[PDB]
Symmetry: T
Subunit: 67 residues, 12 copies
């Protein structure tokens, strides 16, 4: 009946984990419709002078295909 | 030489597992050419009053890239 | 806000995979309320004289906790 | 000597990841005694108009069995 | 005391998943004795014009070694 | 037909691995009926002055559900 | 801030593993901009009369999304 | 140069884990030559009136192929 | 050319996940130079009377080796 | 319909990874018919005075069963 | 607050599994302070004329870092 | 009896995979004694204008502890 597609995005943020996830989802929303669920695959990031520099949440986003 | 792409789809069906897989592949065939193989990643679904409500087969579909 | 619980069941059937899943969900329904989704963890079984004897679907069942 | 049990819960929250984990543990505390440790199995969630709608932390909770 | 061996087979069928599993077990029975249990490792297949062309169930078969 | 449930326990012992497994199964037997099989998921433990202090075997226990 | 996308390709070559990876990346470069990193997921291949016939490197390619 | 083969066996014993492993290796030694190393894949078993009934160590055994 | 080393740390914090990661990286920075990236392996923790007591992020830290 | 068997071999070579894989397949070819595909499970090896001493590619080889 | 380090050791013994684990922890204790917990990653070993020759337990050891 | 330690290194090279592994092992040899075996955990790398820029082999190196 219904068919969904999953797309793997990496959301990044210097503020936090929630912000990194939201960054990815805010970009998906600009282009994709019927965004339904997400799955966090891994949490990575870079290290700077002040500790964590950039949080990087690797993310699978599922959306319903039209037509 | 050849390069293939894999795309992750979720086929759903109220009838059965085979029907769920076929639903995903029937939607892929509308848009993609040179579909070659698939790999079932996981089997999930929803529960209703009569037991299984919707079978949901998470699926990787491999196809040959042109040019 | 909401909290769900997951419970690991193994549904068995001599007839097929769908029947094995349905057996587990039919038993869960007798006792548990607000059954929402399931996840197939593995498919196993026994072998007899006529091939497959019993299909055994190891299954995670998610339901909403009350109150 | 001692025997512990592990139970798989899914804590949900619209506010954040920490709130989702706390939701699950607050519900466990109402019913279970000698809660000791937890293990995050996966982080999932739903998508709405404003990005993340509901954070969902799938969680294993370990507690000491009495007697 | 007892020692079992596991052998990895791939059963294929154009008709369905159950038929693929049965194809592997029917071939094992021709040659091996004391076949006891099986474990499905992965589900793959090929794609044709009519959707799924051949279902391919990768399968571990366990049997008791004699003597 | 039949439906089984799996429950995740952690047996602990200062004496050894076998004693840790037996501790979990001895506690299960007090409360659960038709215990059939177990699966070791992981082996952990604590460290003291004399080496290993407590062996901790994380364990899945499968039993047949009644009625 | 930044958002990356990951795409799963399978590079193939009769010459070697490096050539298979390079095949996939050369095809990505024709169409995608800001290609940054790759991750080898698995190495497979076909067998002919002279041993290995075609090396097949399944590959995840990460690139920065524009705008 | 050298080629090794791996074979998956399941050693069982009512006495203990070490005895289960040794049961598998004692049977391998009767038939196979140049046995070099082993890898424990999982530890399972059955449950009886007195706790553990039979320990079952699933095992990969590596040996050098002749010629 | 370049060689990096990875070290596995567990950062802990009573405040949150981000604080737990930062605690680990702040300790690494005291002793190690050329810290570049991190990978979260798992998220665990302890439970107290107020829910989560201590967040524990198991973490791999990668840094470039000198000379 | 068709049934395939998978066999786990370890090909070794002092010259390189491709040579290690080819060593395994060249030995399989001597004894087995209808060799079709392979899957690299892991890459290991030994260390000597001059760096890598022996590359060791653990390999699954799939072939069609006759008759 | 607190930061722990994990180190991966392989304890070996001809006597048994418990002895292999203890061998690793006895060596760690000579050099490292505040050893707290361990995690068994895998169980391997070598094969001789009399069956198992050497048990080899690959082990992660966690200890609290000072100051 | 014997105790080994494992250390996780990432060897990099612009020339190839073998060169990346050798880079890691050549650096280990400068400082560590009784290097015995290695295990490749993952293969990653960076992308430049000419395809692959730097191969990066994440590697576990095992060596016998002295004394
Ligand atoms: C390049 C790329 C990142 C740009 O992404 P993007 O900005 O989201 O662009 P897309 O065209 O993919 O956007 C979605 C499209 O599907 C439509 N769409 C949105 N929601 C949809 C839905 N739920 N179902 C079906 N179609 C949908 C949109 O209308 C849009 O189509 P449009 O041309 O009418 O505007 C992206 O297209 C990509 O990575 N695709 C694959 C590229 C690739 O891997 N190449 C192969 C190299 S070997
Ligand atoms: C949105 C989406 C789901 C729509 O699905 P769809 O029905 O397949 O629509 P598409 O436009 O992708 O159709 C397939 C395209 O692939 C092409 N194609 C099919 N098979 C091909 C092959 N073997 N080789 C090369 N191209 C091929 C088709 O010709 C078509 O392109 P065209 O419009 O130039 O003729 C899909 O485009 C997509 O996932 N893109 C979004 C990716 C994404 O997540 N973007 C980033 C968001 S932040
Ligand atoms: C090639 C192969 C698929 C042949 O399949 P097959 O049709 O089942 O043929 P078999 O040789 O296994 O015949 C069955 C054998 O198992 C024995 N057997 C059956 N049940 C048994 C049991 N429960 N306990 C012990 N032996 C049993 C039979 O007696 C027979 O042995 P026999 O020839 O001494 O009489 C399979 O044997 C194989 O893949 N061999 C290994 C190939 C390999 O890996 N090569 C080395 C690496 S290159
Ligand atoms: C078939 C497919 C692989 C072909 O890819 P391709 O030929 O290499 O190139 P595409 O046309 O998809 O992508 C190139 C586009 O991405 C853009 N792109 C490249 N780098 C980009 C970047 N970093 N950021 C945003 N966009 C980028 C290019 O400018 C181009 O866009 P434009 O032509 O609209 O200006 C691709 O269309 C695809 O797989 N899409 C998804 C198909 C799918 O899953 N279908 C659903 C079936 S159910
Ligand atoms: C011992 C062993 C390594 C020998 O390897 P080998 O050099 O390849 O010898 P094989 O017996 O496997 O040779 C292949 C056999 O199967 C046949 N065979 C080859 N290709 C075949 C195919 N595509 N389909 C069916 N059979 C095939 C060959 O003709 C040969 O049979 P034959 O001797 O009856 O002529 C291997 O047979 C083996 O691992 N056996 C199992 C050992 C084991 O684990 N048993 C339990 C001990 S605890
Ligand atoms: C059933 C089974 C476990 C019993 O086999 P077994 O008791 O170990 O005896 P096998 O003959 O197979 O293997 C031992 C033989 O290998 C040979 N051998 C031993 N080690 C060897 C090695 N290192 N290299 C090459 N040959 C070796 C020996 O000569 C010995 O006796 P042989 O002269 O008859 O060949 C085994 O035959 C089997 O599982 N085969 C595969 C079954 C299968 O999956 N086939 C397809 C069915 S769908
Ligand atoms: C004990 C321990 C936790 C303390 O960690 P620590 O505070 O970082 O102490 P270190 O010994 O690593 O000191 C850091 C050293 O690394 C050096 N270093 C830092 N960055 C470096 C870089 N990027 N390249 C090369 N060297 C570097 C520093 O210069 C310093 O060297 P110094 O002694 O010349 O001043 C840690 O040393 C340890 O776990 N070592 C291994 C213990 C072990 O497992 N042994 C076997 C037990 S069985
Ligand atoms: C920074 C670092 C990589 C430098 O590595 P390095 O170049 O190999 O230098 P090291 O001093 O650690 O290693 C060589 C030492 O190990 C010894 N060694 C070599 N082989 C040995 C063996 N098999 N058994 C015991 N010791 C051995 C050498 O003799 C030498 O000791 P010595 O200088 O006292 O004579 C290393 O200090 C490190 O990674 N430490 C851990 C970092 C860490 O996790 N710290 C905690 C931060 S929060
Ligand atoms: C060779 C090696 C195994 C020797 O192990 P070792 O027996 O523990 O010897 P170390 O020198 O590390 O001694 C342990 C140190 O940890 C310190 N220490 C012990 N417990 C501690 C704790 N919990 N917190 C902080 N420091 C602690 C000890 O005091 C000692 O340091 P000190 O002698 O300077 O006072 C070495 O430590 C090692 O594995 N280092 C890694 C080197 C490496 O990776 N090489 C680069 C590869 S290219
Ligand atoms: C394979 C798959 C995984 C899903 N995972 C989740 C989950 O992570 N959490 C959740 O709330 N919903 C999950 N969903 C349910 C989807 O959000 C569901 O499709 C949506 O609620 C209704 O679908 P629709 O787009 O047809 O309206 C999942 C659905 C599928 C197909
Ligand atoms: C990584 C990968 C995985 C594949 N898996 C399968 C498989 O699951 N089953 C199968 O029959 N063929 C499998 N194939 C073979 C493809 O179907 C093959 O590319 C096709 O048969 C011929 O390729 P073509 O598109 O160039 O004609 C696989 C190929 C690749 C690249
Ligand atoms: C298998 C297992 C896993 C554990 N994991 C953790 C951990 O994640 N973090 C932690 O602080 N304690 C962990 N613990 C320690 C428990 O919290 C421990 O049982 C408790 O601190 C003391 O036990 P008690 O209930 O008998 O008082 C673990 C214990 C077991 C049995
Ligand atoms: C490691 C292993 C896995 C097994 N898994 C299953 C299972 O998937 N389902 C099942 O019904 N029996 C399973 N069994 C039980 C076997 O079927 C059992 O050996 C058989 O019922 C009785 O053994 P026998 O050949 O000595 O008569 C398993 C046994 C072992 C050794
Ligand atoms: C999740 C993720 C994984 C990455 N893995 C690697 C790695 O495998 N090796 C590497 O050199 N760089 C890796 N990078 C770093 C990227 O190459 C990095 O984004 C690039 O060097 C700079 O990003 P830019 O496109 O914004 O300039 C990774 C980055 C992300 C987001
Ligand atoms: C992939 C593979 C895995 C191995 N694992 C181990 C191990 O677990 N422990 C060990 O002591 N030796 C291990 N070895 C080393 C073998 O025992 C080695 O082949 C033997 O010591 C010497 O080989 P030979 O049969 O040619 O004499 C391994 C070898 C290979 C090929």
């Amino acid at each position: 009946g219904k068919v969904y597609k999953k797309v793997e995005l990496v959301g990044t943020s210097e503020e936090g984990l929630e912000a990194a996830i939201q960054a990815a989802l805010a970009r998906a929303r600009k282009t994709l419709r019927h965004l339904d669920w997400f799955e966090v695959k891994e949490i990575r990031g870079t290290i700077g002078e002040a500790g964590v520099k950039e949080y990087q949440v690797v993310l699978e986003v599922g959306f319903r295909l039209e037509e």
